[PDB]
Amino acid sequence: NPNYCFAGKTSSISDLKEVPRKNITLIRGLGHGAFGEVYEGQVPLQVAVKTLPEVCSEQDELDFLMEALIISKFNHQNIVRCIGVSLQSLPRFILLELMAGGDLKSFLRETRPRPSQPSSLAMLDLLHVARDIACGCQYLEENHFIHRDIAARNCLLTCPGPGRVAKIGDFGMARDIGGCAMLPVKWMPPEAFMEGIFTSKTDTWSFGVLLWEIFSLGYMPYPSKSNQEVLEFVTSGGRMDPPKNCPGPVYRIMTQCWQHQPEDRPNFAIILERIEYCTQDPDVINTALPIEY
Numbered sequence: 303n304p305n306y307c308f309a310g311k312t313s314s315i316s317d318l319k320e321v322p323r324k325n326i327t328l329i330r331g332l333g334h335g336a337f338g339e340v341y342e343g344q345v346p347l348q349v350a351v352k353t354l355p356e357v358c359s360e361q362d363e364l365d366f367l368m369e370a371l372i373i374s375k376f377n378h379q380n381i382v383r384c385i386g387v388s389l390q391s392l393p394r395f396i397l398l399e400l401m402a403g404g405d406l407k408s409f410l411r412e413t414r415p416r417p418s419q420p421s422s423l424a425m426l427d428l429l430h431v432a433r434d435i436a437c438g439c440q441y442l443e444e445n446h447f448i449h450r451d452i453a454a455r456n457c458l459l460t461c462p463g464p465g466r467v468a469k470i471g472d473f474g475m476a477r478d479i480g481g482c483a484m485l486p487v488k489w490m491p492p493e494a495f496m497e498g499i500f501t502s503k504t505d506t507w508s509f510g511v512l513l514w515e516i517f518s519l520g521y522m523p524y525p526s527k528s529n530q531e532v533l534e535f536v537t538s539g540g541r542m543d544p545p546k547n548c549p550g551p552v553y554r555i556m557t558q559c560w561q562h563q564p565e566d567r568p569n570f571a572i573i574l575e576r577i578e579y580c581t582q583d584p585d586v587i588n589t590a591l592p593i594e595y
């Protein structure tokens with residue numbers, strides 16, 4: 303058993319809440335997570351079940367055990383809860399809070415305002431998603447945990463509807479810490495992909511890119527640019543333009559997050575202050591989002 307330390311405490315696989323396999327029942331697949339499936343399931347309690355391929359290397363497994371350890375020790379409303387694990391049967395299961403809304407990136411793409419659904423999403427919705435994740439980022443920051451891949455694809459939503467809550471839901475990056483084309487360089491600050499240096503200011507840069515993902519309604523960052531072109535571009539002082547219709551106050555948060563010097567980039571308390579100010583600002587939240595035909 304590997305060790306894990308967080309918030310002043312070491313824990314071990316023994317600390318994971320084993321749920322007996324007989325209590326768990328798979329319902330439907332939900333998606334392929336590169337390595338292994340995720341199911342909807344019941345334990346009645348509804349769950350997403352992250353599975354470990356029965357055929358996998360020893361590292362695949364440690365990664366898996368490690369991810370459970372990480373997610374279980376977090377306690378916050380914008381970080382996905384772990385109901386427990388089922389390690390004592392194959393395939394091994396990690397049991398998570400079922401997030402009906404699915405991942406944030408898919409959500410933004412499929413629920414973009416449309417001619418048929420002209421107002422499926424408003425500025426205030428995105429502002430609320432942003433605040434949610436930044437609040438989870440605040441929680442990580444003040445516990446000295448560096449996520450390393452804050453991006454829309456690693457965020458989930460409780461429900462499709464307006465009372466939706468965004469949480470951070472994947473931690474397989476801070477877990478692995480692969481190759482160049484694997485690293486998410488489009489979400490990375492310059493010192494991270496140049497020097498391998500990670501601090502809390504890493505997540506601030508990444509959060510700016512996520513902010514861009516959110517307000518563009520789910521686009522790939524630096525549109526039309528490859529990883530290497532981004533690397534040179536970002537390294538030369540280039541930054542993304544505002545997404546379609548983005549309010550200037552919101553774009554300003556992004557650019558503040560994309561400061562070359564990490565010590566010049568805000569901490570998440572400041573970012574929250576600024577997002578709160580945007581939600582209060584009628585010129586921001588009255589701004590209509592683009593309808594794609």
Ligand SMILES: Cc1nn(C)cc1-c1cnc(N)c(O[C@H](C)c2cc(F)ccc2C(=O)N(C)C)c1
Nearest residue numbers: 333334335340350398399400401404456471472
């Ligand atoms: C409903 C629903 N629809 N969809 C499309 C996904 C769900 C869903 C609901 N609740 C979860 N807890 C959950 O977790 C997984 C581990 C996950 C977490 C994450 F942050 C990013 C992606 C995934 C993912 O979907 N993978 C294949 C890796 C998935």
